[model samples]
Target: KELVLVLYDYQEKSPREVTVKKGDILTLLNSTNKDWWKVEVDDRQGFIPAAYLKKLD
Candidate 1:
């Protein structure tokens, strides 16, 4: 199973400010497959390693 809309970016001082917008669909891939997730923001897609994300239960 995959987790979607998982907010990955936050403001340093505010903390409550989530940079991952509402329309964005952030993917949380299973750890077995390189432990990374591909994110698409405004037609640009990049791989964000799981190491940088705080997983949501």
Candidate 2:
């Protein structure tokens, strides 16, 4: 499980919103036609474009 940072500055009114932490596993779920990847980051899951992620070794 490797979670990546999607939106570091996600602006929302809900404190329960998912936030990418230091030690989390992010899994790619779905994506659009573009190079984006919808991933599940630990207990908090969201969609992050592939361009924003750095492949882990």
Candidate 3:
């Protein structure tokens, strides 16, 4: 299974827009949230909306 996903764009949300760009690769981490997923992008760990990402491979 792919643990990493690719960023498509800034998905607007309650947390505000995701700052990552079009090609940023986000490493997914296990968590309890449904709408948002734990992710690592640009050397930082944060929450990104599930709809904004697709499996990297």
Best by TM-score: 3
Poorest 10 consecutive residues by lDDT, candidate 1:
10-19
Per-residue lDDT of model 1, residues 1-57, tens digit only = 345554445222333222454434554434454665554444444555444454444
TM-score winner, 1 or 2: 2
Residue pairs clashing in model 2 are 1-25, 2-26, 3-26
C-alpha RMSD of each candidate structure in angstroms:
7.7, 4.8, 3.4
lDDT for each residue of candidate 2 in 1-57, tens digit (9 for 90 to 100): 444544343332345434454434456555553665666755665555465554443
Which parts of model 1 have CA positions greater than 4 angstroms off?
A: 1-3, 10-24, 27-34, 51-57
lDDT of each: 0.45, 0.51, 0.64
By lDDT rank, best first, the candidates go: 3, 2, 1
Indicate the TM-score of model 2. Answer: 0.42
State TM-scores per candidate.
0.35, 0.42, 0.61
In the range 1-57, model 3's lDDT, one tens digit per residue, is 245554576644546334666767766764457787777666566677777777765
Estimate the overall C-alpha local distance difference test score of candidate 1. 0.45
Model 1 alpha-carbon miss at residue 51, Å: 6.0
